[PDB]
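Summary for the steering committee. One of the milestones for this cycle was to obtain a three-dimensional model of the protein with 195 bound, which we needed before selecting residues for the alanine scan. The sequence and ligand used are listed below.
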Amino acid sequence: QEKRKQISVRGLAGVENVTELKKNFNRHLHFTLVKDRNVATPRDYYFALAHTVRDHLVGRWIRTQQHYYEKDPKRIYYLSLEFYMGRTLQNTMVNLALENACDEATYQLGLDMEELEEIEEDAGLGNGGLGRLAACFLDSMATLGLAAYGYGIRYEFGIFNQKICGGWQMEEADDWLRYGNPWEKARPEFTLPVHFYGRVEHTSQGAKWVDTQVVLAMPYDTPVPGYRNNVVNTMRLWSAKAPNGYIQAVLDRNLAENISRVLYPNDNFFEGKELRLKQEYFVVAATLQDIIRRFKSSKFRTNFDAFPDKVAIQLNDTHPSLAIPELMRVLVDLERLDWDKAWEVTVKTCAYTNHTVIPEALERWPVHLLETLLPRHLQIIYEINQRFLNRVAAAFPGDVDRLRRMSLVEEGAVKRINMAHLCIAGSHAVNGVARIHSEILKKTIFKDFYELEPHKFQNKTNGITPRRWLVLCNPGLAEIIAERIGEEYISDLDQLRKLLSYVDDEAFIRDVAKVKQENKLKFAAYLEREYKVHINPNSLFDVQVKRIHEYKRQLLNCLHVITLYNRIKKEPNKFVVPRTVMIGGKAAPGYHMAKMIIKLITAIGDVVNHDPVVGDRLRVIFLENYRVSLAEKVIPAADLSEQISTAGTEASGTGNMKFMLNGALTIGTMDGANVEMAEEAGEENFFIFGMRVEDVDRLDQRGYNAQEYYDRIPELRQIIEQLSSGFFSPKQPDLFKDIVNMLMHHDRFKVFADYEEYVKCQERVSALYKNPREWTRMVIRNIATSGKFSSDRTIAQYAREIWGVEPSRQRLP
Amino acid sequence: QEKRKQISVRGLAGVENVTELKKNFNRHLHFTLVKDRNVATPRDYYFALAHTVRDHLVGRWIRTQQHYYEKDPKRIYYLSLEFYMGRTLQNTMVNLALENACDEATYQLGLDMEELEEIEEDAGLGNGGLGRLAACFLDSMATLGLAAYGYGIRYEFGIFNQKICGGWQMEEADDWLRYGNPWEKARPEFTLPVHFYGRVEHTSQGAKWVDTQVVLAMPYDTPVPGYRNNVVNTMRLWSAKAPNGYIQAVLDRNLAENISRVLYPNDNFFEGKELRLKQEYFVVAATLQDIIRRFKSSKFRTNFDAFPDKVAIQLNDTHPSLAIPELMRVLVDLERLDWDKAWEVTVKTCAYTNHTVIPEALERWPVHLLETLLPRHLQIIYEINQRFLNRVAAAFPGDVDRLRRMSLVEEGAVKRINMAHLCIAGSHAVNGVARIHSEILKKTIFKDFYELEPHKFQNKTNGITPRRWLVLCNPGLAEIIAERIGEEYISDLDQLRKLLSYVDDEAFIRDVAKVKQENKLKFAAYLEREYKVHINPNSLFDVQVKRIHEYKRQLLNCLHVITLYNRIKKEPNKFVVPRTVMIGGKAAPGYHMAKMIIKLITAIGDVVNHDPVVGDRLRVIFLENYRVSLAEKVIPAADLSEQISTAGTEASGTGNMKFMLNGALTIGTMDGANVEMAEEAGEENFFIFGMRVEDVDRLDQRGYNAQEYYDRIPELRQIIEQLSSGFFSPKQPDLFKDIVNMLMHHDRFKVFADYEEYVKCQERVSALYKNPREWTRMVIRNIATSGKFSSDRTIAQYAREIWGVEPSRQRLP
Ligand SMILES: O=C(Nc1ccc(Oc2ccc(C(=O)O)c(C(=O)O)c2)c(NC(=O)c2cccc([N+](=O)[O-])c2)c1)c1cccc([N+](=O)[O-])c1
Ligand SMILES: O=C(Nc1ccc(Oc2ccc(C(=O)O)c(C(=O)O)c2)c(NC(=O)c2cccc([N+](=O)[O-])c2)c1)c1cccc([N+](=O)[O-])c1
């Protein structure tokens, strides 16, 4: 209690407030939960606390949205298929300053609030960084006083819960709404119809899309509290409902309603399923009618010219790019605007964000698919293309190949639509997510596009919110910082720079290292308690957490681990810094290699964690079911953060940033925002290793030959042989043959080309660790220069150079 | 307002109470509904009122159930697949005395409570009288202070909403939970597993039912407020949940969970679908584990002898008869009691109620069905049979045919299990639902059973609650009665007898006729408003409301109607009492004749309601979507109640009783409880017509010949010819050919044998109507002797002669 108390960044536990809090809790438990302390379960406790928290939101929520209604600002909609929201109770107490009062309140009712908090389900409505980006962004736009709205799908089931079984992943259904959701509010009043299939008739009005199937979109609003400023914004998620023999028709209502059933769990990967495209059409069509409906109920042919003055639609990826042809659909067919005015309007409303350079991430929908589901949209996409391509022709006369290259229509055996091309055509702005990425789009992927309309293209380096990702998750760190520099930094992270004044302050040095070791013990107790996993709290915590993928080179990490192990066994008496190597993250079901790689990790620990010579010198664990809430625990405890993807394949990354905020040192490549983080801190304060992008490209120019590295490196040859022969899986010697063959003959990610430098760099890291003070002073240097990686920074830029709106930090009443 | 005020049976609108009520409403609208009066919709108003009402229940609910816990009475469980609950808000205000306060409260917030009330969805969780019986019974057991629990299934969709289209029924999905349900409380804490399929292994423990599929049963408790006595009992309804490629497995969770999706809409009819048997297994298995679990957490080999001292399980029909072999399943396999002790226990816990003599109503499950779904239950049913049949043998030595007749095993092409036989074998008591019915079971259907174990067999004449079915629905009638005799009658309906003192009281005569005419104008405004149906308020309201069936002889009614019409056209100048003939009720989808008959009704009105000669003399309407809530409106407005089924086919009826309570005169046959209602009132005060049961039987002895009546009755011949030739459906002359052929060659219900007497009796009815005073004095006689048809009477009998518990009317604190 005393620590929780002590922490000033957590607010006042005022006498009347704690008296009221406790009162509202009893009352909720009696009326809402229909309970007494004899029969309440912990879960009732949770729900009793959650209702009391949420009651603090309502008045603000009601009034913020009344204010938008009254004032009619320009409105920002953030359209995404994913909001990686994680839990909400701590979060709302944070931004409402209620955390220490609620803490005192509950203690006094004989209840540990942390314990109640662990009852809450995450809203795991995303797959990895774009989804989580989306959630960080709602928070910053709230904190920036913007008239912003998140728009997505209320899935039944979010990302699958991961169970490791026998060292393999087992997917279970994430039934996060089993017990209901105190956070959401049903909005029946705003249910809309969405039309699927049917056909198009050209009449004297124009076109008319007839004989369609109808699914209803039912919205559920969720409050988005800003930091301590009396703003509460909404996320609105749509859920599919069937319109209003005999038994079999009712049972078959499930078919329409399966559109919001389940997040597709393919991160960084296009699988072209029709159910996925219905998901995408669903959210798009409902959001844009709701949008056009608000526009209609606000100011005032007057109207639609001004529509881009009144509306911004941000496309998170190409997942809601049907926004473009739908907007046009409405304007042209329904509103009867002329094609050219309607196109002017669209391009002024819409901007697109790219998250990936990987070609296997791009959405390219078979036209037959689109032609059946969405006959009218296809026609509009053809008209869009034609006229766009007439523009390329005019600018590059005779450049026929360029026509073929820029076309939204991919020729082939299967015709398909390039959803990225679509998006660049129909948006006034196209961004990447970090300085290098946005250069490569301009230099490569969208090079011809850039030449056309160079003013379209921008950079918006990612951030993370310093509420969830420092104040919530690392209240310790948060508190020793506020102690020196006060509390303003929490929504002005650039204030962190002030901590460079403390690099040679003995109490600061001491406190920082104290806080991390405090977090290491907590994490280590979590592992015992929840998973009976025993780890060394006096070791280097080396963490790689992120979805499992080949580009991400969990495999290069595993080679480092087996090197460490093999060196020990060679010189057993020789000293080494003790490590706990933690690898966590989910594989897409059906990503065979990624599932292979999880299995190899746990296989490495089966060996490594049982060698008596090794003892407590090295330990390998796979952290089960990595999610937002799990992030919030292991990130504040890590010493080293692994950011090891091949140069040029991680667009930005954001995990990098969370680990920076919270006092880990980074081993990485110059990739994504790792480059800007090295810039911030100075490269003298990072562990940058291996190829730059230019060295990958030179490798590709002449040919990656994995065997060249094999033949030259006896250490890498010892491990390959281990893997082949069955050292890591004796009961099935041939188990890792597809890992080996990929590494040997088909590695698109060049793992062996970065091997020798990664291991030498890891040498450097452990040398620094053997001097605590100097570790802690470089850490200081890292924390101190992470303020650029706040999402307030990122969002203020989107507002000023895309949405064409001014941010704010003036408190509402 | 002034009438609503005036009504003393509706309680006090105390100054502080109205101040608190209004306060809790605002507060609910703010916190629960997240609203202001600018944005609230009516539906929010509703939900704001409902939350405030329900808050008055909670403390009582908590404490009533604490009291059962503390005291550990013997417990009554009422197992039914159906609870025809209808709406709840008015009902709870009634039994809590809050109706006039809530009335004043809302008025003062500028809201009409009646209007809010019309927003509520019925819980249409039943098909007709057994389902509704079930709901009347929860109410009486509450009012009688019994430790009773309703146990059923929380369907997704209750009985289909009926739409009449072109004069046909159209079924729509009753999505009654769309907007959620303020009345229910989720009980995750008491989720149980139910096992389907699998197989049986006989080991050294005994039998063991292995490799099963698991569905979870999730309970939702609903409060059952007693009348003004501070008892709140629970109805617990179970909802199916799936246990805790990749996408297609999540989507396929619907398959397990489709067990609670939808009420099967077959009233008075066995269709032998496996999904239906899963429904039946579901509710049974979950309820009995919950039951055996309570028994285990209460008093104390000690235990299970006393289990029938501590448990009563009432079987509403044979729908939960799997209760028997399941109870045994548990006792034998799980608890390891010996077969003979376990059988003693079962028979002492279980009693069965029969609702039907019709053979097409009986559940007779193919064994292969049972053998697959429920291998172990089948084995136990075989063992049960064997030993039961060994008992028949011993009592009737050599009577081989009797063996075959009594067997739970039906031989044939398809083997099947007789669920009724099952039930008589495994229950200590078997009842019918009205004096005549229970004689016929003893004399016919269960004759051999009766000879075996004559002490098994009982009668429990049905009732209806005089809260829903007078105080709620006819507050007028309720108020003029209380004016004379005070308010005690409401839970002592036998007090009504006191009104015979008023048969020659001019003010009483006047007030009764006033109240009915008041209800006639209201109903008539409902029809205009909600359905734009214009009716004559100065006519005789002749109502037949009940599910559509051949036994029920909606068709004999239609013949009366076309007689009336044809007589007018014959003598147009001749005076007749003006009628509005209202026929309402649903057909089972797939019951072809019943759907034909709806169509004939509306076809009759197409003719009849457009003949200018007829004018406002006769009008025929089909009342759409008959349900509990609709009952509550048209019953208080009817003059004549039609109870015209063939003698011996309506087991009891309860609609008869509602119309009696509320001041309609009855035309009927001596069938079901019509006979006891004629007894109560004296036959001089009823319109009894046609065959007695003995005259049906004599008809069957020699042969029903429909053509005999045709040849003898020129009036019935004029109509048959109308129907054939296409008078009622000129655009399709042949439309009613299957009605005609059934009437001519296959009428199991002898419509023509009752024709001449029904029409003459209808002559009598209209003669009486032409003298208002004398109508009103016979009505007085009817209201005055309906107290026997209260369900308090019925339930006190079940308690004393079945459950072996004393009723009570002492108020809880
Ligand atoms: O304008 C007034 N009130 C209001 C007015 C408006 C809104 O919010 C609002 C309503 C409708 C629309 C729209 O047309 O799209 C928008 C918008 O333009 O974005 C915003 C209010 N707050 C809410 O309705 C609200 C906010 C948050 C959550 C919920 N919810 O879960 O339902 C509801 C309260 C007002 C003006 C004057 C007097 C009163 N009053 O006394 O009640 C009220
Ligand atoms: O026994 C005590 N309290 C209690 C004890 C028990 C019950 O109800 C109850 C609990 C469990 C069981 C059971 O084992 O099956 C039964 C039963 O035997 O039937 C009844 C109470 N009331 C409720 O739990 C209740 C009632 C109605 C609705 C809900 N609901 O929706 O969740 C809950 C309150 C008690 C005793 C002493 C002190 C306190 N206290 O101070 O809190 C409480």
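Key point for the committee: Chain A has two domains: 4-463+791-810, 464-790.
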